[PDB]
Symmetry: D3
Amino acid sequence: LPCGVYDPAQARIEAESVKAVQEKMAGNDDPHFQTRATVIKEQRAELAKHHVSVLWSDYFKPPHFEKYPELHQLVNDTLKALSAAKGSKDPATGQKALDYIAQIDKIFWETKK
Amino acid sequence: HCALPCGVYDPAQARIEAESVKAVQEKMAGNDDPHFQTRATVIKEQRAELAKHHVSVLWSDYFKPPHFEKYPELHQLVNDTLKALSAAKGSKDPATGQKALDYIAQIDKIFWETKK
Amino acid sequence: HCALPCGVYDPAQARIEAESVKAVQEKMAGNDDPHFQTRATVIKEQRAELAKHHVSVLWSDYFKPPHFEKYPELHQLVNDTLKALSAAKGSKDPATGQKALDYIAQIDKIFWETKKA
Amino acid sequence: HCALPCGVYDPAQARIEAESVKAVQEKMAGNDDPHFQTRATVIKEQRAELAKHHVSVLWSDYFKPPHFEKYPELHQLVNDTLKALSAAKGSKDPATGQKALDYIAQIDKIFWETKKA
Amino acid sequence: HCALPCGVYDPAQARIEAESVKAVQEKMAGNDDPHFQTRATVIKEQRAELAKHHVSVLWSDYFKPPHFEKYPELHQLVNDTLKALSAAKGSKDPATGQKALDYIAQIDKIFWETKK
Amino acid sequence: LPCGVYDPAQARIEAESVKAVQEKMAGNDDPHFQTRATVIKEQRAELAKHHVSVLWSDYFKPPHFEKYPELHQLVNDTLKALSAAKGSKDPATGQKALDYIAQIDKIFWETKK
Ligand code: NI
Ligand code: NI
Ligand code: NI
Ligand code: NI
């Protein structure tokens, strides 16, 4: 629009679902459950990626990229971490994507200050 | 928020989309360009429907019969919230967006209570 | 089914999608091919979610407070239908797809009464 | 309607969405509020596209070569239906929504014959 | 590709999605991990449906009656293409993806002919 | 997945539709047509953005960002150009987004060489 309402919480919540699904995949080896878990994980990781991408294209502005010169690469690393989580059943991959999003969330809130 | 049961629900998702609705209403009051007005209408329509989807999901996928027994007004509160969001969708008045936010806040309160 | 409002609602939309869920469940018992099993699982997840959406729309956008007054079990019926569709979503047992259809049929019966008076 | 195949098809899905298109068109003649006009336009674009999708699915995934042999006008009928839905999409005139429903009704008649034999 | 009539159609969109389908089939032959197999099945299902949507759109929104008169086999060619894509969707054999690409290539040829 | 099939042509085709719609908006002042044109433009610009974002997150890799150190900013500029086109009826905005995508397309094809 823009309307100006952004919050990395959207990206965070979806990535939390990714990790939560990967964790459930460890405790239920039923093939149908594993398949559904895979299906859901794939959707949620892609929605998390979309939320991170929207922050980067629609919310962050040149003065933010000036002030935080590592921002472009951080967002790109976050997206690849989400791709790695969606390709894995290991909750450590989910967690890494969450740790990256946390770094974006800090930067975001600093820029609202 | 998609019955795995994965377990992760947060009314923040409904709230953030409804906050977008209200923000767009506020903006439509300030700029009467027809193209902007149209784009605002498009966005508002999509965000309000996303907000309704998140609220519906809490209601069907997160809340359980023990909750509906402990909070007998919850079903109607959810229905009113969805109707408040449809009302905001159809309106440019930010007070309609705020009313939808107020209803979501009541849901959020109950939600965090069931977490405690 | 769009909250314009346009006033075009019909539980047939929920029913068709829930019929698809059950049909997929029945096909999963007839073909153990892992690739087919996975595709069936993909489809069922999608159709079950659309069914839930159609039900939710009827409840939020079609049914009104007089209907809720007149049918005080209706809120809980709609909730049960959605949970039944979630249970079908999570299962290969066509009994679960059937149970969801049974609930939809009950909504369908209320709906058509409200179209008379 | 998913090409699993699950074998659950019904032109009712196309018809309901095309009914919505016409209902929206009729509502646009009754309320000149520019905001309402725009919302009506948003909704109609969406419902018309879903209608086209349902028709296309019946043609690609339900109808088979014997049906095409037996009903040699069917390809062109399906094409005309989709173009009619595009014309409704582009118009506020409910006559266009009606014309699209007329075509769907013709598909519906063929469909149900193929369910008998 | 959405009847404005905006005018911009290119069978490349159908082709690129069908090329993705074939690429995923080829990959499923190389790696029998169940999780990878599932993810490949998910992706293939989505891309094949996108390809079918693009082909359907050319057929309803781009091609006109003069074209169907000049190319009387076009309707059935489109129907066969959609069925070839549904066949690829249901298969792991890259030859099914290639067959769908072959049918799309026939459409693409006719398409560029109507441009000349 | 990845499967490895990427082509900036997807982003290009959608952005071409954006510009084509903006051009049609100049020759038909009917309010219903202007509204539909706005609706369609909004969808196509967002699909173009999604295609550009996917290239940047899923196709480009660290050695590409090393070799082309202007790549992150170019992709970000391309996305904001698409946002500007979706907020405008001026075909010059559509064209600018296309000119940016053209720069990405050149880089893409170099990296396949
Ligand atoms: Ni969930
Ligand atoms: Ni409606
Ligand atoms: Ni089906
Ligand atoms: Ni178009």
